[PDB]
Amino acid sequence: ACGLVASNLNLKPGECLRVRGEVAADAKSFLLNLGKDDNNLCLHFNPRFNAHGDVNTIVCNSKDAGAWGAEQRESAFPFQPGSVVEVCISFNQTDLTIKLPDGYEFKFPNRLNLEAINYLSAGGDFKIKCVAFE
Ligand X SMILES: CC(=O)N[C@@H]1[C@@H](O)[C@H](O[C@@H]2O[C@H](CO[C@H]3O[C@H](CO)[C@@H](O)[C@H](O)[C@@H]3O[C@@H]3O[C@H](CO)[C@@H](O[C@@H]4O[C@H](CO)[C@H](O)[C@H](O)[C@H]4O)[C@H](O)[C@H]3NC(C)=O)[C@@H](O)[C@H](O[C@H]3O[C@H](CO)[C@@H](O)[C@H](O)[C@@H]3O[C@@H]3O[C@H](CO)[C@@H](O[C@@H]4O[C@H](CO)[C@H](O)[C@H](O)[C@H]4O)[C@H](O)[C@H]3NC(C)=O)[C@@H]2O)[C@@H](CO)O[C@H]1O
Question: Quick one: 64 exposed, middle or buried, by C-beta within 10 A (0-12, 13-18, 19+)?
Answer: middle
Q: Which does 46 bind (CB under 5 to 8 A by kind): ligand X, its own copies, none?
A: ligand X
Q: Which does 128 bind (CB under 5 to 8 A by kind): its own copies, ligand X, none?
A: its own copies
Q: Is 70 one of the annotated binding-site residues? A: yes
12 binds its own copies (CB under 8 A): no
CB 59, min distance to ligand X, A = 6
List C-alpha distances in Å: 99 to 37, 39, 76, 132: 23, 25, 11, 14
Q: Which does 53 bind (CB under 5 to 8 A by kind): its own copies, ligand X, none?
A: ligand X
Residues 105-134 that bind its own copies (CB under 8 A): 127-134
Taking the C-alpha atoms of residue 126 and residue 115, their distance in angstroms, rounded to an integer, is 28
- Which residues, at least 6 apart from 116, have a Cβ–Cβ distance to it below 8 Å? 10, 11, 12, 13, 36
Q: Is the dihedral of CA 41, 17, 96, 24 positive or negative?
A: negative
Q: Check: CB of residue 45 under 8 Å from CB of residue 109.
A: no
Residues 55-94 that bind ligand X (CB under 6 A): 59, 61, 68, 71
Per the annotation, binding residues for a beta-D-galactoside are 44-48, 52, 61, 68-71
Binding-site ranges for ligand X (CB under 6 A): 44, 46, 52-53, 59, 61, 68, 71
Binding-site ranges for its own copies (CB under 8 A): 2-9, 127-134
